[PDB]
Ligand binder design. Structure first.
Ligand SMILES: OC[C@H]1O[C@@H](O)[C@H](O)[C@@H](O)[C@@H]1O
Ligand SMILES: O[C@H]1[C@H](O)[C@@H](O)[C@H](O)[C@@H](O)[C@H]1O
Length: 291
């Protein structure tokens, strides 16, 4: 006898392709569960997102799912939500806290390890690596890159990170950094490990403009977007990883709405991302989108 409850989904931006997909799944899911949904867009600003989260309370949200712009800057706003006793969870990103709300999404640390293991297996006697990292204060970056670094370190000094730069998750930055640094290295690196697809796709454009062919420098990504899957299929990109946004979003909304409607526990969801190479593209959530 219950429908049209207001749920807010606070995203840090709607400019990056992963965030755009999270919004898509959320709107679809909202219709299936017969809830009202507002997807708030932080515009890559912590100040805006904090304000968005204040508005979520004023607007009478019955549940709030938050993907924080920043590990620390959003914490006060999340604390206000908790004090108001509004059912809440994080998704994708997190905030640093001693009593976190439930979280929905892939284990980024494990994902980072898994990407590193695949690189090491491709270069078992070592490699020179360019590492492109995400928005520094995003927990998705922090955890994923820690996994990558720790697992490369466990492989030993034969894995050498010769460039280590943030691209803030942006395609344009992957392009700029790779076009800028490749000419300055006395030896061609073996691998470019990108913390996401967007920067890896920009790296690929850079390599293409430098006159290189697919596979001359290995490139890894993360997010399993259709464009990235197309580049895995044609060999420009060695791997991506599926952190299963349809599962994360649908499960987060189902559990939050279940708490609203029936007082069911919000348990969260933790799982490893699935590494996607050329031989297993059909395991990606969005395989049907590859023309
Ligand atoms: O007021 C109509 C609303 O009904 C809800 O059950 C739907 O989930 C919304 O998508 C819609 O806007
Ligand atoms: O904002 C970022 C960005 O969209 C990355 O591409 C994605 O891998 C991260 O999970 C997300 O937090």
């Amino acid at each position: 006898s219950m429908k049209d409850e207001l749920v807010v989904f606070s995203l840090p931006n709607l400019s990056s392709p992963f965030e755009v997909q999270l919004q898509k799944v959320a709107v679809e899911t909202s219709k299936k569960l017969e809830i009202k949904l507002q997807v708030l867009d932080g515009q890559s600003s912590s100040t805006k997102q904090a304000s968005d989260l204040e508005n979520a309370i004023t607007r009478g949200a019955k549940g709030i799912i938050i993907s924080p712009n920043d590990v620390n800057a959003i914490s006060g706003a999340v604390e206000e939500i908790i004090k108001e006793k509004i059912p809440a969870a994080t998704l994708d990103r997190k905030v640093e806290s001693s009593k976190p709300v439930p979280h929905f999404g892939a284990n980024n640390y494990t994902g980072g390890q898994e990407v590193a293991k695949a690189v090491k297996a491709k270069y078992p006697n070592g490699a020179k690596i360019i590492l492109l990292t995400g928005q520094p204060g995003s927990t998705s970056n922090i955890e994923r890159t820690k996994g990558i670094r720790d697992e490369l370190a466990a492989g030993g000094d034969k894995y050498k990170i010769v460039v280590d730069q943030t691209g803030n998750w942006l395609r344009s930055e992957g392009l700029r950094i790779i076009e800028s640094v490749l000419p300055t290295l006395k030896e061609k690196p073996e691998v470019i490990i990108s913390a996401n697809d967007d920067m890896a796709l920009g790296a690929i454009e850079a390599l293409r403009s430098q006159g290189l062919k697919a596979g001359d420098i290995l490139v890894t990504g993360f997010d399993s977007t259709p464009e990235a899957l197309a580049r895995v299929k044609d060999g420009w990109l060695y791997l991506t990883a599926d952190q299963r946004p349809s599962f994360a979003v649908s499960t987060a909304l189902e559990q939050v709405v279940g708490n609203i409607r029936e007082s069911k526990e919000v348990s969260g969801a933790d799982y490893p991302p699935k590494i996607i190479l050329k031989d297993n593209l059909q395991e990606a959530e969005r395989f049907a989108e590859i023309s």
